[PDB]
C-alpha positions as semicolon CSV with decimal commas, in nm:
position;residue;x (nm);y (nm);z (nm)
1;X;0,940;-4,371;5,334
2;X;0,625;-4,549;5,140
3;X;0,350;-4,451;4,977
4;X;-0,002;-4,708;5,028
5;X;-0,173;-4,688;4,624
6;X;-0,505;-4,874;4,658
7;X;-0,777;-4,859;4,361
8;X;-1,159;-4,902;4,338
9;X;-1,252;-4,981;3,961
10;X;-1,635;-4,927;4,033
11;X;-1,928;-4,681;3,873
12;X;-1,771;-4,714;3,496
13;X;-1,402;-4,532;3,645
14;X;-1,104;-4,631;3,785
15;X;-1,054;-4,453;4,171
16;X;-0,708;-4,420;4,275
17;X;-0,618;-4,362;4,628
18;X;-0,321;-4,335;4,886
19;X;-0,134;-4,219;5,171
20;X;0,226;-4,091;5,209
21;X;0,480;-4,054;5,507
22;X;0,712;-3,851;5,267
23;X;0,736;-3,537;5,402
24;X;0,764;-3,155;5,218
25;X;0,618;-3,311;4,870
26;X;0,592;-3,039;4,625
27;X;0,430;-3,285;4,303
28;X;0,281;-3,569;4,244
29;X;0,288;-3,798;3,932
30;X;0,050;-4,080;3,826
31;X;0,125;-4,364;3,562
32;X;-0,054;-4,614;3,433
33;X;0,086;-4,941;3,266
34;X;0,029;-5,000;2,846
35;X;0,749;-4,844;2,826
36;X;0,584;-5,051;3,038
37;X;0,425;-4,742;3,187
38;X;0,322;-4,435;3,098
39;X;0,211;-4,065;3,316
40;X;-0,141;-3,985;3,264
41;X;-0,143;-3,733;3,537
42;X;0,101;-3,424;3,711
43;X;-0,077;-3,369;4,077
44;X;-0,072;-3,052;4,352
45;X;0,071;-3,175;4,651
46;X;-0,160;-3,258;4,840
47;X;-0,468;-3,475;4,637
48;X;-0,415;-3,834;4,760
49;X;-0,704;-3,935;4,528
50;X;-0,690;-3,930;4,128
51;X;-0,994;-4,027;3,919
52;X;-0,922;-4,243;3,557
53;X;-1,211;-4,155;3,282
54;X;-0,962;-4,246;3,008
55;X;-0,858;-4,652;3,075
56;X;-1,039;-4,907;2,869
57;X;-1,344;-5,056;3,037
58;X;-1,217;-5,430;2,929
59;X;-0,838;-5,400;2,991
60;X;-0,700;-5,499;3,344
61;X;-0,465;-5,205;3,459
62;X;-0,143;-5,126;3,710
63;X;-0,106;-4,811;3,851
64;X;0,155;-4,625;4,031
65;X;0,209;-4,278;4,203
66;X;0,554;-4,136;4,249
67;X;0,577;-3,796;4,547
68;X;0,839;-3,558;4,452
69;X;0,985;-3,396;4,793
70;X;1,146;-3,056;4,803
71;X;1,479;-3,260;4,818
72;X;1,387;-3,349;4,498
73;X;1,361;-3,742;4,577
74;X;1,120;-3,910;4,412
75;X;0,933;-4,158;4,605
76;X;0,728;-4,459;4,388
77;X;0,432;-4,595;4,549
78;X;0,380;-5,009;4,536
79;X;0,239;-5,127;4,231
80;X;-0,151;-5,133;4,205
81;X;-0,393;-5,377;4,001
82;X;-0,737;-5,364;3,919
83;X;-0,706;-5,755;3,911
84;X;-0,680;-5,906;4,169
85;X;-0,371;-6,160;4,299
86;X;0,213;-5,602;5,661
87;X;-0,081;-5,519;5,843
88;X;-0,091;-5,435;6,199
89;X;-0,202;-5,671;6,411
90;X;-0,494;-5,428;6,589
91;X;-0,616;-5,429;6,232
92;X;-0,925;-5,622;6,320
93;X;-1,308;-5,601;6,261
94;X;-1,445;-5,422;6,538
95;X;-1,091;-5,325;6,664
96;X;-1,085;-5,048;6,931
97;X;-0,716;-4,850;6,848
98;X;-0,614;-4,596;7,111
99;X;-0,339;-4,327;7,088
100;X;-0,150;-4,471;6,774
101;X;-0,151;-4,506;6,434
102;X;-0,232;-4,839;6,240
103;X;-0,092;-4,937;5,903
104;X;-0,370;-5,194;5,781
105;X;-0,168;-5,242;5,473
106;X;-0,484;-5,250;5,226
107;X;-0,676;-5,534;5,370
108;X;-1,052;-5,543;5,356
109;X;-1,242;-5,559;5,697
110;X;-1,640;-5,531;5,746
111;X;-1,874;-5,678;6,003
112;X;-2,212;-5,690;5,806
113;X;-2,470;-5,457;5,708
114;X;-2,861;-5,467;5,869
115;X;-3,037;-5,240;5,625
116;X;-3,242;-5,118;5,955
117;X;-3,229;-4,749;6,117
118;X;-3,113;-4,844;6,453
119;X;-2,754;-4,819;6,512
120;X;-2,507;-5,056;6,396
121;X;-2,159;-5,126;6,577
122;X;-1,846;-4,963;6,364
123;X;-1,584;-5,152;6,217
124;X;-1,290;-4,967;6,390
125;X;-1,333;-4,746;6,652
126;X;-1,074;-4,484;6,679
127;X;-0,997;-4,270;7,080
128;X;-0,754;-4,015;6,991
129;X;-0,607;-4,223;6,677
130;X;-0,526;-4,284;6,348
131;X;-0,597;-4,518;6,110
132;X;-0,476;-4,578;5,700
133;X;-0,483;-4,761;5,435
134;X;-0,822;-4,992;5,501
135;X;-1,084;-5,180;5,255
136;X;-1,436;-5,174;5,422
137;X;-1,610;-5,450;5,280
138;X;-1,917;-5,418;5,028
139;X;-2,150;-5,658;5,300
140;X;-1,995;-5,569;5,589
141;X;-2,026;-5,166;5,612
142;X;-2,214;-5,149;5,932
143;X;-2,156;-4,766;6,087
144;X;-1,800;-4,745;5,943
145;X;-1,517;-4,533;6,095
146;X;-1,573;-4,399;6,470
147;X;-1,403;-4,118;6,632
148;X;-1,515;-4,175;6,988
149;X;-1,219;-3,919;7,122
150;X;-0,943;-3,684;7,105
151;X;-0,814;-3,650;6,755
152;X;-0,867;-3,881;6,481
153;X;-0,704;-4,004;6,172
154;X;-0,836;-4,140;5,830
155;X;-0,627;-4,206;5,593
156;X;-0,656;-4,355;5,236
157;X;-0,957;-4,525;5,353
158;X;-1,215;-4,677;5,094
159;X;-1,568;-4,765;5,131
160;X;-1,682;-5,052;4,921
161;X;-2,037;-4,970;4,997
162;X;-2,179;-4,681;5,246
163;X;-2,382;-4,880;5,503
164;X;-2,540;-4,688;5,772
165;X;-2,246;-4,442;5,768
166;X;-1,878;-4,407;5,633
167;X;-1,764;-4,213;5,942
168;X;-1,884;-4,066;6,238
169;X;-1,731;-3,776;6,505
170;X;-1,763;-3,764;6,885
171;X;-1,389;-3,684;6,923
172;X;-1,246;-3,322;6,916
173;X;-1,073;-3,353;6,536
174;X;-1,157;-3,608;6,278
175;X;-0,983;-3,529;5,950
176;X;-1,075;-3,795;5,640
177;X;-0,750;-3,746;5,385
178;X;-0,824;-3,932;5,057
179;X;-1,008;-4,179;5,086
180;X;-1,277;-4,352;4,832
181;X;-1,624;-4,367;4,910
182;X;-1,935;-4,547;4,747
183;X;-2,279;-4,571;4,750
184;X;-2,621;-4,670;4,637
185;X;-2,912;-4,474;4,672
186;X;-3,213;-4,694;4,850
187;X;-3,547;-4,602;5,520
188;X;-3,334;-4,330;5,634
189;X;-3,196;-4,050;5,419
190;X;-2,849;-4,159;5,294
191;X;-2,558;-3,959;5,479
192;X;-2,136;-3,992;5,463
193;X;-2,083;-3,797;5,751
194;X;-2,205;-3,802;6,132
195;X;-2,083;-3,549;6,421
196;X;-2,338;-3,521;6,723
197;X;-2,116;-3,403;6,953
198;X;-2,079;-3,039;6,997
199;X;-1,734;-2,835;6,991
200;X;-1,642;-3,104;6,748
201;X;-1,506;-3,030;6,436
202;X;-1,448;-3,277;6,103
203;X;-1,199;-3,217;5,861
204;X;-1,212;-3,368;5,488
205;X;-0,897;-3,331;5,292
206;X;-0,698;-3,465;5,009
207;X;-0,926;-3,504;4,758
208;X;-1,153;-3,748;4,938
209;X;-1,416;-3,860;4,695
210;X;-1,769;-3,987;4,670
211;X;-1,862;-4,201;4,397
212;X;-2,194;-4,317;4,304
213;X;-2,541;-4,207;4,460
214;X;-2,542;-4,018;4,737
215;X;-2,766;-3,846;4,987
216;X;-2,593;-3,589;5,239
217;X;-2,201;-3,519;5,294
218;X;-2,344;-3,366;5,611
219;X;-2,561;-3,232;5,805
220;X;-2,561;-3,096;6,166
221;X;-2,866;-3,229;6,326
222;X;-3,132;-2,976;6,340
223;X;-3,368;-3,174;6,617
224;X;-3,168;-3,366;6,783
225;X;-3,222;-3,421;7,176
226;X;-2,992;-3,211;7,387
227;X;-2,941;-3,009;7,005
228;X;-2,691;-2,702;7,012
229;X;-2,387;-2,652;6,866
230;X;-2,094;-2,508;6,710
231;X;-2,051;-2,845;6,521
232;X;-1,768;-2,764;6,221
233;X;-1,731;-2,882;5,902
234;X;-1,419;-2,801;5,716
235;X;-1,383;-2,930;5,316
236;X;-1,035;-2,863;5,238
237;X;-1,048;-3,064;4,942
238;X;-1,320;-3,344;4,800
239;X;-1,457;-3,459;4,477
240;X;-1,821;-3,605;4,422
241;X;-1,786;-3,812;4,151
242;X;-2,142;-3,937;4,073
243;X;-2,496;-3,807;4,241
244;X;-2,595;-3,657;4,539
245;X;-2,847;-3,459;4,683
246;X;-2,681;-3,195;4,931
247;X;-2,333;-3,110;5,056
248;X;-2,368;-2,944;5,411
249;X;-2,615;-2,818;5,706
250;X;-2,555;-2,635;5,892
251;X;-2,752;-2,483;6,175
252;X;-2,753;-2,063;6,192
253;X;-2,827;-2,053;6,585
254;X;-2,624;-2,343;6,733
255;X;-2,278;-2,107;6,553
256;X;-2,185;-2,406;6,342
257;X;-1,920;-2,292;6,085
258;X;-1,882;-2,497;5,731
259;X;-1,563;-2,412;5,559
260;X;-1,547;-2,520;5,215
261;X;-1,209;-2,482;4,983
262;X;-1,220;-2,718;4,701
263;X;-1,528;-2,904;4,649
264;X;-1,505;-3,033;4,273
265;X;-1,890;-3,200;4,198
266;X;-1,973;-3,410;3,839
267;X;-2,173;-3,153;3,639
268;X;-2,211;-2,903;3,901
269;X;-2,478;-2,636;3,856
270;X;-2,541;-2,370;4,155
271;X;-2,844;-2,492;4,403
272;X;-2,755;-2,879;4,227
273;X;-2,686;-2,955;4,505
274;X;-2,649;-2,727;4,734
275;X;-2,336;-2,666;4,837
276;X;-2,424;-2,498;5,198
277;X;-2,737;-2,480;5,365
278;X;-2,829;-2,310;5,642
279;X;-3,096;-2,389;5,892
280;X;-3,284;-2,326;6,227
281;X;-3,140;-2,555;6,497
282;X;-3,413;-2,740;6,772
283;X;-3,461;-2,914;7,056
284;X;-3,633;-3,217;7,012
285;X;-3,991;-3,185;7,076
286;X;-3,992;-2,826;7,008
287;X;-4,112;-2,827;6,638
288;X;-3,943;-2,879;6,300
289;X;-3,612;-2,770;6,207
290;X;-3,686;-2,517;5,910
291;X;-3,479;-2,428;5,655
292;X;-3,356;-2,110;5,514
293;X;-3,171;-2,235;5,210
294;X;-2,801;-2,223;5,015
295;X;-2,588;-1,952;5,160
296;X;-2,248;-1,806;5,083
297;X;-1,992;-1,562;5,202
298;X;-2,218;-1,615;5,570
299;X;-2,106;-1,687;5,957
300;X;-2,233;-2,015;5,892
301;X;-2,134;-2,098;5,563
302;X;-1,780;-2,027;5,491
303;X;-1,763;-2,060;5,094
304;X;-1,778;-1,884;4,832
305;X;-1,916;-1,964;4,467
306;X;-1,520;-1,974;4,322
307;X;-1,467;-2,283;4,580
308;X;-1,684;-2,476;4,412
309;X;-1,660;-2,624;4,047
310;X;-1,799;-2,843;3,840
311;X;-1,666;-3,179;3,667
């Protein structure tokens, strides 16, 4: 067994992030070098993301994670610096990975980054797949992580810098565990997530955070061309770290179902942001999309006000 740490000091914190093939883990433990170590954390089982508010700004850190299984082994992730100084060989920019998973062993891929609307090409592009442990590059964001089919994988993945989008759904399942995301607000509305397909359904779990300024986690698209639904969201776990201006859309009519379990949002207030908003799906051409506003306990929106807290 291994366990993948990779770290994003960025947005005045230190992001830690990884993925485990240790099965039946009942705790998790986080240290942070200074006895040449010491535990600044005791973990659920299933976060693979930590935040650090407490290291000094100036000081270079290491970091490690140990899993503790129900056979009581205790499995150490690799060493991780904030300074700086194995992966598969389909690990490439632009790759298209089919029915397997890829180990990119932390490496940083991108393509580049137009700053236009249009559609930009993705920098993997998963059919029924998985991928872990991946850098995308600050300049070379493009349109991210593609799920063209089946189910999808993404796993301790972190995003440098949110380009058009971090990750996008056409497949049956995409589920995001961990996973560091960041962006910077400004022409299109910013947005993490992006699932046109219908019958589709996008999972986010262990403790996948945003960091920095953000637009939209996600949004069904209320007047799209050939619009309808159900198109499912389901937060198992997530953290925004930083700004952003709504968490999910969804729309009443097309049946779309967001499912929201732990959401944890820096200095949360109820209606900032939203958490789940519901709205009235169209066809393009056939007027505006309106909206009805935050809902909870609803067919639509599946969360209530004790799954979300603030931080």
């Amino acid at each position: 067994d291994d366990t993948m740490l990779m770290l994003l000091k960025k947005d005045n914190a230190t992001y830690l992030s990884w993925s485990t093939d240790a099965g039946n883990v009942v705790r998790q433990d986080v240290y942070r070098s200074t006895a040449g170590s010491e535990k600044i954390a005791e973990l659920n089982s299933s976060d693979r993301t930590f935040t650090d508010l407490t290291a000094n700004p100036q000081s270079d850190y290491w970091y490690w994670v140990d899993t503790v299984s129900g056979n009581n082994s205790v499995l150490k992730s690799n060493a991780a610096s904030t300074a700086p100084a194995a992966a598969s060989p389909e690990c490439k920019a632009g790759a298209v990975i089919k029915d397997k998973t890829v180990d990119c062993g932390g490496i940083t891929l991108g393509l580049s980054c137009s700053g236009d609307s249009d559609k930009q090409p993705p920098v993997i592009t998963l059919e029924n797949a998985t991928i872990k442990n991946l850098r995308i590059s600050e300049k070379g964001g493009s349109d991210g992580i593609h799920c063209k089919s089946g189910n999808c994988r993404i796993e301790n993945v972190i995003w440098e810098d949110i380009c058009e989008d971090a990750a996008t759904n056409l497949g049956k399942t995409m589920t995001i565990v961990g996973g560091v995301a960041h962006n910077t607000t400004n022409g299109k509305p910013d947005k993490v997530l992006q699932q046109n397909a219908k019958n589709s359904h996008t999972i986010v779990q262990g403790n996948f955070t945003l960091t920095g300024q953000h637009g939209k986690l996600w949004r069904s698209c209320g007047d799209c061309t050939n619009n309808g639904g159900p198109r499912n969201l389901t937060i198992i776990s997530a953290t925004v770290n930083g700004t952003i201006d709504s968490i999910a859309g969804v729309n009443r009519n097309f049946g779309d179902v967001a499912e929201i379990r732990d959401l944890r949002i820096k200095g949360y207030k109820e209606g900032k942001p939203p958490v789940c908003e519901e709205f009235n799906g169209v066809e393009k051409g056939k007027g505006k999309s309106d909206k009805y506003g935050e809902f909870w306990d609803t067919k639509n929106c599946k969360v209530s006000r004790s799954n979300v807290k603030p931080l």
